[PDB]
């Protein structure tokens, strides 16, 4: 599998490098993608550039790591970058993507509000924990959920960050539970990682 960091950022004019681990051979490629548009190949075979791609983009690799460097960052370099490789005999796999932000405003850590299931939803025999994440920049976060102290993976849906009216970012994450699951645990938590911080909010069925 290929692993990429969730986020990278730099100011216009600076150089940035993003890594992809789990590579092996020289069949490494990198794609750039803007919201609502198809990816575009920017580097193939580790370090080759397609015609039309600026020499500001370069690639390197060592052993089990491949790296894309963007020199002289420009605003429209902002987007999500995917690494890719051939693996096994003839399979293609992709990394999970890195959002590259070209810094245009102050960094801001997320505010997190975690709503327990409403009485009305519980009465409808459903339970949704709603984790609302606001006022952050760069617009990239990773969300993890816990039941008591244990990671929960199943039943999680998380939206891609998008801009608020104040031009900071917001995102939402949902944990779907049965009412019995909700009531049977001591607590549930939404953990939001942003750059170098994590903010965790916790709610409990026994508390208001």
């Amino acid at each position: 599998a290929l692993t990429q960091p969730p986020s990278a950022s730099g100011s216009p004019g600076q150089s940035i490098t993003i890594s992809c681990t789990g590579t092996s051979n020289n069949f490494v490629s990198w794609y750039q993608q803007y919201p609502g548009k198809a990816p575009k190949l920017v580097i193939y075979e580790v370090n080759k550039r397609p015609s039309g791609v600026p020499d500001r983009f370069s690639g390197s690799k060592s052993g089990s790591t491949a790296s894309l460097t963007v020199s002289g960052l420009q605003a429209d370099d902002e987007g999500v970058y995917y690494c890719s490789s051939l693996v096994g005999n003839w399979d293609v796999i992709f990394g999970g993507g890195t959002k590259l932000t070209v810094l245009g405003q102050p960094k801001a850590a997320p505010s997190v509000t975690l709503f327990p299931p409403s009485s009305e939803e519980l009465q409808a025999n459903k339970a949704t924990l709603v984790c609302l994440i606001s006022d952050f920049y760069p617009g990239a976060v990773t969300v993890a959920w816990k039941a008591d102290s244990s990671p929960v993976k199943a039943g999680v849906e998380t939206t891609t960050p998008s801009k608020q009216s104040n031009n900071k970012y917001a995102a939402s994450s949902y944990l779907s539970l049965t009412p019995e699951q909700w009531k049977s645990h001591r607590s549930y938590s939404c953990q939001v990682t942003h750059e170098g911080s994590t903010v965790e909010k916790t709610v409990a069925p026994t508390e208001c």
């Binding site: 069949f27 190949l41 075979e45 005999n89 509000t113 709503f115 949704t128 606001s134 998380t158 998008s162």
Partner: protein
């Protein structure tokens, strides 16, 4: 430049068949230079390889077909080189197959290879076509309250189909501090979203907060009063 254009149904019912066609212009799929295939991307997620194949005119055999192992049992890809078309068929689909599907031209060690060709990178992508997998008929939303310096409060807008819904607050009289999130497609094949507003804590006892949900496809409007909790 060459173009790859996807065509096919944008809504497919669960457990039924997702079929797409890609029409190539400005290149010939009967070249030994490339493989032809598909990549998809679930909304808000990353890229996933579907597979690719080759069928070029030559004095040796040029028939190769490679599939994503996790999809192979329900995946068919094909080429009709005279029509310059690539085809995708995915059976027994579920909401999880909801994705933007991209036609893709793959380069790599293809024309000259050892043992077998190794198409590794996509140098030409189609625009992509979003295919939603759901067996839902048009359905209006259920609306639940997200009950509350400042305080956040909101509405959870659940189990509607198709998109979109729009949300206002207090019939438009409350716009400052409002954010309505993108929808999520749930395993049921129905969408949910939330809308939130931040207001002064001191206003909670005395100010009325109502979210107004419009779902035009079902001709439904829902107004939900969001009150402070009793605790």
């Amino acid at each position: 430049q060459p173009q790859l254009q996807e065509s096919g149904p944008g809504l497919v019912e669960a457990s039924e068949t997702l079929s797409l066609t890609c029409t190539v212009s400005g290149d010939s799929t009967g070249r030994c230079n490339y493989f032809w295939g598909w990549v998809r991307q679930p909304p808000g997620k990353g890229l996933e390889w579907i597979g690719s194949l080759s069928h070029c005119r030559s004095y040796y055999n040029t028939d190769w077909t490679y599939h994503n192992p996790s999809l192979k049992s329900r995946l068919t890809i094909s080429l009709d080189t005279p029509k310059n078309q690539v085809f995708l068929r995915l059976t027994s689909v579920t909401a999880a197959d909801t994705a933007t599907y991209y036609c893709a031209r793959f380069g790599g060690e293809v024309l000259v290879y050892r043992d077998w060709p190794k198409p590794a990178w996509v140098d030409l992508w189609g625009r992509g076509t979003l295919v939603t997998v759901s067996s839902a008929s048009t359905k209006g939303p259920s609306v639940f309250p997200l009950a509350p310096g400042t305080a956040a409060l909101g509405c959870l807008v659940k189990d509607y189909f198709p998109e979109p819904v729009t949300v206002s607050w207090n019939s438009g009289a409350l716009t400052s501090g409002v954010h309505t999130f993108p929808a999520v497609l749930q395993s049921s094949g129905l969408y949910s979203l939330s809308s939130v507003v931040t207001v002064p804590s001191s206003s909670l006892g005395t100010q009325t907060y109502i979210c107004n949900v419009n779902h035009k496809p079902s001709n439904t409007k829902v107004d939900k009063r969001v009150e402070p909790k009793s605790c």
